[PDB]
Amino acid sequence: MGATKILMDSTHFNEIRSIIRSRSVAWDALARSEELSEIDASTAKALESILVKKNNGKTLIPLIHLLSTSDNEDCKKSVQNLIAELLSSDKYGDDTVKFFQEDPKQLEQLFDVSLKGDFQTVLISGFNVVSLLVQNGLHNVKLVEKLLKNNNLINILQNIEQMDTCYVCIRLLQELAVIPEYRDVIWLHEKKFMPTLFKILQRATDSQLATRIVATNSNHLGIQLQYHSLLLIWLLTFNPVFANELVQKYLSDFLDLLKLVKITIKEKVSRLCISIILQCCSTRVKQHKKVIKQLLLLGNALPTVQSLSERKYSDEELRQDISNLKEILENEYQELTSFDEYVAELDSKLLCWSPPHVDNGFWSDNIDEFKKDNYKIFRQLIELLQAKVRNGDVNAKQEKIIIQVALNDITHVVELLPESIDVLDKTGGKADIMELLNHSDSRVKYEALKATQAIIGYTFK
Template sequence: MLLDPPTYLGSLQSNIRQRPIPWDGAVRAGTLTEEQLARIRAVDKVKRDVRKQAIEADLNGYRILFVGAEGQKSVLESAHKRQDVVQYILVLLSDLLADIPALAKAIIQTGDPYRHFLPLLAHSSNPENPIPLLTSTVLVGLMAGSRDESPATVDKALPVVFSYLSSLTKNSDAGLQDIGVQEYSSLLYGRAPRRQFWKQRSDTVTPLIEILRAAAGVGNNDASASLWSGMTGTARSGFEGSLGGGVGLQLLYRVLLVMWQLSFEAADIGDDLNDEYDIVLLYTQLLRLSPKEKTTRLLVSTLLNLLVHNQNTLLPTAVLARLPGLLQNLQTRQFADPDLREDMDRLRELLDEYTKTKTTFDEYVGELNSGHLRWSPPHRNAAFWAENARRILDHDNGALVRRLADIMKKPWDSDKAVLAIACNDVGCLVGEVPEKRGQLERLGLKTRIMELMGEADENVRWESLRALGGWLQYSFESK
């Protein structure tokens, strides 16, 4: 998918192309050789077809020009003291790689194709310094143009490039973020780059999630609590003017595109992606707010990839996030994109099939596994606890009550209702299966409930008191 280059980068490259370079003087000064200059002139400021013909007729010569060979310096080595020449060569090479894929493949066949470029990424710590920025564009063009997945690319060069691009996506300047995100997109051309991208997720994925949370109007502190609260609050019908958190539509689209590309690894990373970033909940919220059909398409397609490959774990979360109802509402809109309509139909069918067979117990398990409790129907339903309390305690050797204990360990500063609900559930378990109190005590639940009696939140205090009262009742009766 071709996108227009980011405005800042396009403007920088255009300015450099227009700079006059005293080439003859550079030759006389020994900055570059006559042979190097001849090859540069043959492809500089000429028509695209002339440029293409010249390079394809002399691929080895141009490979040596840019990356050198034994006993022959590359033009970047020769001109390393002339920053104006280095910048010009980087822009020229980027243009050539975009126009002539054969050049990228020829350069990649060099023994160490990246040795002259990777050091330039560390040329300056200033994110606006043109040389690292232009170098990253060359490296992206080189990797994407050749679609190389060799160890030299994936294990050696790609981690360095991803780290540099992450510094752009973490920058507060939207123009630099835009460059980093679009270059990410160009690099996710195959499984090996996508897996490396995920491996470096604290640098690569996390800043993108932060951009998406900002667009959804969710802070990064206690983002999960804020998202779940949004499920029960009044949602906006869509973005008007600028997006939430100051995220522009172009940047939002490019971030969603990168995440969509990453979702093709959903079979391997889908559960972790949701556990670490609440991706299903976040995407449901973004889908509710999606301002354009093109962003809606990426959101729906990504959700489809995730849910198809992780049905047992993510479909319950999607139901809790109220995705089925949202898709039903979206069905009334007349989308022009046939691929979007097809993906929405498939997603609805997947969720409909799941909800047809879903029990209240499944709903409760899905909520526990989501890591966030809300006042859904099972919690206050006496018949549910009478029927399912023992099953919850015994399920998967106590995995569900361990999950409940883990939830209760957190302070939930932004959503104290979670603690109140957890206390309610513990009280119900004790009330229905009092002989299992020891199991709950060994998980620290009784101690935690006693601690929560001192909480400032009135509802938490009340529910913890109720739970402890049931505990004490059965303790006295057993004496």
């Protein structure tokens, strides 16, 4: 069989094997002074001789015996390593793999030896248990849920300042996630691993690719770390509920994906960032209209996507994801009624620019509709711009957002209809605009100058 083929040729895993193999622990002596019996030591020795050359899983049972009975981390790491070496190779230790797999008992026994002494120990064991679970002849959710709840495996995972630790841990979790059933239990323990997964990704964005560090750059080690994190994510997000839940909790961290796509050339990192967003924007996902607004507006998703479309990546699939995501965000905002959007923002008092909220057409259609008591709705808007400046001052975060928007809306309407000029004068908005030129911030004086020039043009040609 040769079980799982990952974590055999993997570099961080090889670094961990050197430490274990460097050290030589004599079983014969331990066994003689008692910590184990002669039969367990004879088997362990014979086991080294099979791996290096020539032709058992019959050997499996005394090694399981040794692991449990001894408490000594050095012998147990050497026994566990040898077991790992066989499990993955299909040149050495095909028979070994079968022996676990037939009888679930030696797996539960192998799970025992997990959560013991040194951090290397917990990795090796975790690697062997994870290899049998993903073979489709056995599965147990309880093992995976249980291993998740624990302190020691999550502590190792949390550290990212040792490449080796993180690399193995994210991979164990993720490999298991491929199989649909785990996705549900893995998500329960999310809140522990998930900020850390986000931290590796952010960490990559900030450190320039123009250099080379050996920790995570454009070299093979870094490329895998980013990939693994994103892959673990993508997998959970495939379920329709989970994806809605992901956006609402992790929002800040989530927006950072757009950034990854931009700095990398790596088709592994980028495809997955765009894809994870595409899944959450999907029709299938509950409250997709909300998530789409949030992404486009805050995260600048639409502008970022449009720029991407010109500079596509060689692989086709990457192109498909760029095109499909681009369509939902854009379609969604414009296809809602113009009158609805305008009334909804003014009433709640929360205003922000949006794709059809800045279009000339939006206003053109909506002017007539306003009239009910001489453009009563427009008049309420001028009243809102007036109110904000006087009450609660100006250059407070909230109140400043509204002013620029309110001023954009009033230019378009005024430039469109000459009758609007009376409305500014009656309400007293015309004076408020003159003050706004003087009121700080570039976007504010910019909008005020546009607001003034539209008014002037109809008074005096």
